[PDB]
C-alpha cells in the first residue's frame, strides 16, 4: 504493498508532469538503510543488468545529509557526485528534493533528463516539492501503522 | 481546531503549485469530512482586506458542489452562467473561467481543488486539467494519511 503503491503514484506524477525520462524515490531508515526504492522510466532488462540497488551515495547521499532541493544541469559535474554503476542509463540533468514532514526527513524524490535536454526549472522544483510533501505525510503515517 | 501543520503546509504548497502552473489568478482547496461538509478552506490570490470584506467562508455551494455530486473534472468558460451557479457573495472578486476537480483517494472523497481566471483570458486547457487532477490526487493522499495519523 500500500505505501509502495502510493509512493509509485507520486513518482509517476512527478516524472510525467515535469516530463522527465526517469524518476525515483528512495526512502531510508534512520541509519540510512533503504526501505523502499520505487522508480520509473527504466526497463526490467536494464534493471537486471545494473544488479544492485542504490545505497544512497553521492548526490543522493548529499540530499540525505542536507535535505533541501538540488537542481543540476549535469549531475556528474557536482563535487559530491559518486558516478553511475556499470549498465546504468546515462543521466545528466537532475532535480532532487526531500520527502519529509517538519519532525523528520525520510527520503528523496528525484528526477533526471527532462525532455529535449532542458534543465529543470524553478516551476519544476516547486511542483516536485509539493508532491514530495504529500509522500512525506504518507511515510509519516506508515511508520505509525508500523507500529 | 487548526489543521495539522504538515497537512496545512502540504495543501498550501499544492494550491500554490496548481495556481502558478495553470497560470490562474485564483486557487482554492476545501477539505471536507466524509459527508462532504467543509472543515477547512485554503486559498491564494485574494488580499487580506478583500477577505475581511467578504466576511464569511464558502459552504461549497453552486458549481463547487457539482465537483462532489459528479466527481470528474469540470471546466467552464463562464462559471456564474451555469444553471447550478449560486453566484458570488458581496465583495467577492468576479470570476469567469473555472477548472475544478474532486480531491479523492479511490472512491473516498476528501474535498475539492479549483482555480479561476487563467491570466491570459483563455479557457483552461486539457493540460491544465491533467495537472490539476494529479495535484488533487496528491492532496487526497495527504488528507487521507494526515487523518489516519491524527
Ligand atoms: C529510473 C530512475 C533512476 C534515477 C533517476 C537514478 C538516478 C541516479 C543518479 C543521478 C545517480 C548518480 C548520483 C551521483 O553521481 O552521485 C545514481 C547512482 C546509482 N544508481 Fe540510479 N537511478 C535510477 C534507477 C536505478 C536503478 C533501477 C538502480 C538499480 C536497481 C540504480 C542503481 C544505482 C546505483 C547502485 C548508484 C551508485 C550510487 C548509490 O549506490 O547510491 N538506479 N542513480
Ligand atoms: C481565492 C480563491 C477563490 C476561488 C477560486 C473562489 C471561487 C468561487 C466561485 C467560482 C464561486 C461561485 C460558485 C457559483 O457561483 O456557483 C464562489 C462562491 C463563494 N465564495 Fe469564493 N473563491 C475564492 C475565495 C474565496 C474566499 C477567500 C472567500 C471568503 C473569505 C470566499 C467566499 C465565497 C462564498 C461565501 C461563496 C458563495 C458560495 C458558497 O458559500 O460556497 N471565496 N467562490
Ligand atoms: Ca505559465
Swiss-Prot record, chain A:
Phenotype on disruption: Cells lacking this gene show no changes in gene induction following hypoxia, or exposure to NO or CO. Another publication shows a severely attenuated response to CO. Cells lacking both this gene and DosT have no response to hypoxia, or exposure to NO or CO showing both proteins are required for the hypoxic, NO and CO responses. 95% decreased induction of the DevR (DosR) regulon during anaerobic growth, 50% decreased induction of the DevR regulon upon exposure to NO during aerobic growth.
This protein's name: Oxygen sensor histidine kinase response regulator DevS/DosS
GO biological process: one example: detection of hypoxia
Effect on the protein of changing residue 110 to F: No autophosphorylation when Fe(2+) protein is bound to CO or NO; no change in autophosphorylation of deoxy-protein. No change in auto-oxidation, slightly higher affinity for O(2) and CO
Subunit-structure text: The isolated histidine kinase core (HKC, residues 386-578) is a dimer and autophosphorylates, suggesting the protein may function as a homodimer.
Described purpose of this protein according to its UniProt entry: Member of the two-component regulatory system DevR/DevS (DosR/DosS) involved in onset of the dormancy response. Regulates an approximately 48-member regulon. Required for full induction of the DevR (DosR) regulon; acts later than DosT to positively regulate expression of the DevR regulon during adaptation to anaerobiosis. Characterized as an oxygen sensor; O(2) acts as a switch, with O(2)-bound Fe(2+) protein inactive in autophosphorylation. Has also been suggested to act as a redox sensor, or perhaps as a dual oxygen/redox sensor.
Effect seen on changing residue 88 to A: Weaker than wild-type heme binding
Effect caused by changing residue 143 to A: No autophosphorylation activity no matter the bound gaseous ligand
Domains as described in the record: The first GAF domain protects the heme moiety from auto-oxidation, contributing to the full-length protein's very long half-life (more than 36 hours in buffers without transition metals). The isolated ATP-binding subdomain (residues 454-578) crystallized in a closed form that is unable to bind ATP, suggesting that ATP-binding requires conformational changes in this loop region; in this closed conformation it binds a zinc atom. The isolated histidine kinase core (HKC, residues 386-578) both autophosphorylates and phosphorylates the isolated histidine acceptor subdomain (residues 386-452).
Organism (species): Mycobacterium tuberculosis (strain ATCC 25618 / H37Rv)
Induction (free text): A member of the dormancy regulon, expression is controlled by devR. Induced in response to reduced oxygen tension (hypoxia). Induced in response to low levels of nitric oxide (NO) and carbon monoxide (CO). It is hoped that this regulon will give insight into the latent, or dormant phase of infection. Member of the Rv3134c-devR-devS operon.
Whole sequence portion shown: 63 to 208 of 578
Any one Gene Ontology molecular-function term assigned to this protein's record: carbon monoxide binding
A single cellular component GO annotation: peptidoglycan-based cell wall
Note: Was identified as a high-confidence drug target.
Superkingdom of source: Bacteria
UniProt: heme binding residues: 88
Amino acid at each position: 504493498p500500500d505505501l509502495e503503491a502510493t509512493l509509485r503514484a507520486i513518482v509517476h506524477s512527478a516524472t510525467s508532469l515535469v516530463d522527465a525520462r526517469y524518476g525515483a524515490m528512495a526512502v531510508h531508515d534512520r541509519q540510512h538503510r533503504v526501505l523502499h526504492f520505487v522508480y520509473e522510466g527504466i526497463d526490467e532488462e536494464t534493471v537486471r543488468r545494473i544488479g544492485h540497488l542504490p545505497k544512497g551515495l553521492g548526490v543522493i547521499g548529499l540530499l540525505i545529509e542536507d535535505p533541501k532541493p538540488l537542481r543540476l544541469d549535469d549531475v556528474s559535474a557536482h563535487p559530491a557526485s559518486i558516478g553511475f554503476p556499470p549498465y546504468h542509463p546515462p543521466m545528466r540533468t537532475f532535480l532532487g528534493v526531500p520527502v519529509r514532514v517538519r519532525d523528520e526527513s525520510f527520503g528523496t524524490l528525484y528526477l533526471t533528463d527532462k525532455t529535449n535536454g532542458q534543465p529543470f526549472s524553478d516551476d519544476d522544483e516547486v511542483l516536485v516539492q509539493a508532491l514530495a510533501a504529500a509522500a512525506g505525510i504518507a511515510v509519516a503515517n506508515a511508520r505509525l501503522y508500523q507500529q
